[PDB]
Design an enzyme around this catalytic site. Structure first.
Site, short mmCIF file in Angstrom:
data_model
loop_
_atom_site.label_atom_id
_atom_site.label_comp_id
_atom_site.label_asym_id
_atom_site.label_seq_id
_atom_site.Cartn_x
_atom_site.Cartn_y
_atom_site.Cartn_z
N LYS A 40 0.82 -1.20 0.00
CA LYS A 40 0.00 0.00 0.00
C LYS A 40 0.86 1.26 0.00
O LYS A 40 0.60 2.20 -0.76
CB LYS A 40 -0.95 -0.02 1.19
N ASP A 61 -2.24 -1.60 13.27
CA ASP A 61 -3.45 -1.66 14.11
C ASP A 61 -3.47 -0.49 15.09
O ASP A 61 -2.83 -0.57 16.14
CB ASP A 61 -3.49 -2.98 14.87
N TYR A 169 -21.22 3.34 16.83
CA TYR A 169 -20.22 4.00 16.00
C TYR A 169 -20.18 5.51 16.25
O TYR A 169 -19.10 6.11 16.38
CB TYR A 169 -20.50 3.68 14.52
N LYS A 173 -16.95 7.80 17.96
CA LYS A 173 -16.36 9.06 17.54
C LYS A 173 -16.38 10.09 18.65
O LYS A 173 -15.41 10.85 18.83
CB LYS A 173 -17.09 9.62 16.31
#
Length: 344
Positions: A40, A61, A169, A173
């Site tokens: 990548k 990670d 979710y 945040k």
């Protein structure tokens, strides 16, 4: 002087991050991005950015609190600016605390602790990519009598955001951003850096890069979805604010350059939409798609009639540039899609 400034960008392959790095390189900054693999990073350096001023480090990670320790040990005397855009992988789970909330908080705390450990007096500016979701719960998003500003906080608790996957979710945040401000407050005298956050609504816009010949993969789903639906296909239900990815990227860069952005939450939001809004705009701007994509129910499902209003006057005054409006976003996004499929 920009080439004498090294900027670390976590999650360099991401939709937002690629536009940030493009803009950074165009300003002659030195950039180190973090990527999940050598392949990548190499694809980024040599097929996308194509710059001797782009280097990369492997960080796999970000739920590991020590994930950025090697980067800042190696580069801790050189990195003056950290644009932390990386987020944990989002995946289906029923264990929201373990798989969503804890990784998101550690995903913020980790890199900050790495800066404290190895670069406390070197990093001058940190910008953390956050979310509209730190400003409101899902349960407070549809109150036309309320108002969301940069000072609003998602009111969910650790426990009650766990009722469902989207709400959890959103909560992830919230607590990830809270951890950034809490870190700064607790370490005001231990670390040098100033902190801002860039908190976007639903992200639209063209890809930084498209590889030709391929089904085309697109990083913001809903516009490409509608473009490919047939006339009689049932419509998705999507309503939020919208913001162009390039404006988000530009805001991150101003948020480390400009002293008036220090210590601010920046609400990256240009206007409200529902799927009807998008259909109306796409059909109007692309005659070639009329009668091929859905028309919907023009005049129905106005977002003003559904969504909590968003007042980001502060953010717009401080950033000092005009956000792209929906017409510009649709023109750029859809024409990129249509041209790419034409070329393939």
């Amino acid at each position: 002087a920009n080439n004498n400034t090294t900027v670390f960008v976590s999650g360099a392959s991401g939709f937002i991050a690629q536009h940030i790095i493009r803009q950074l390189l165009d300003q002659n900054y030195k950039v180190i991005g973090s990527v999940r693999s050598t392949e990548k990073g190499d694809n980024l350096k040599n097929a996308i950015f194509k710059s001797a001023n782009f280097n990369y480090e492997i960080v796999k990670d970000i739920a590991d609190l020590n994930a950025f320790d090697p980067v800042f040990e190696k580069h801790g005397k050189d990195i003056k600016v950290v644009l932390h855009t990386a987020s944990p992988l989002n995946f289906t789970t029923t264990e929201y605390e373990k798989d969503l909330l804890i990784p998101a908080v550690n995903g913020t705390k980790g890199i900050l602790e790495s800066i404290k450990k190895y670069a406390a007096q070197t990093v001058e500016r940190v910008v953390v990519t956050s979310s509209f979701a730190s400003h409101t719960s899902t349960v407070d998003m549809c109150n036309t009598k309320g108002k969301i500003t940069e000072d609003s906080w998602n009111q969910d608790t650790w426990e009650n955001c766990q009722t469902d996957a989207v709400r959890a979710y959103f909560g992830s945040k919230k607590f990830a951003e809270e951890a950034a401000w809490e870190f700064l407050n607790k370490n005001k005298d231990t670390v040098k850096f100033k902190l801002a956050t860039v908190d976007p609504v639903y992200v639209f816009g063209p890809q930084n890069h498209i590889e030709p010949g391929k089904v085309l993969n697109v990083s913001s789903e809903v516009i490409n979805q509608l473009v490919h639906l047939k006339k009689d296909d049932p419509l998705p239900q999507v309503a939020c604010g919208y913001i162009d990815v390039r404006d988000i990227a530009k805001a991150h860069i101003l948020a480390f350059q400009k002293d008036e952005l220090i210590g601010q939450r920046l609400l990256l939001h240009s206007g409200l939409f529902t799927v009807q809004t998008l259909l109306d705009a796409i059909n109007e701007q692309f005659p070639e798609l009329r009668g091929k994509i859905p028309a919907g129910e023009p005049g129905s499902n106005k977002p003003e009639d559904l969504l909590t209003p968003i007042d980001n006057t502060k953010t717009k005054k401080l950033l000092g540039f005009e956000f792209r409006d929906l017409k510009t976003i649709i023109q750029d996004t859809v024409s990129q899609i249509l041209e790419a499929e034409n070329a393939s």
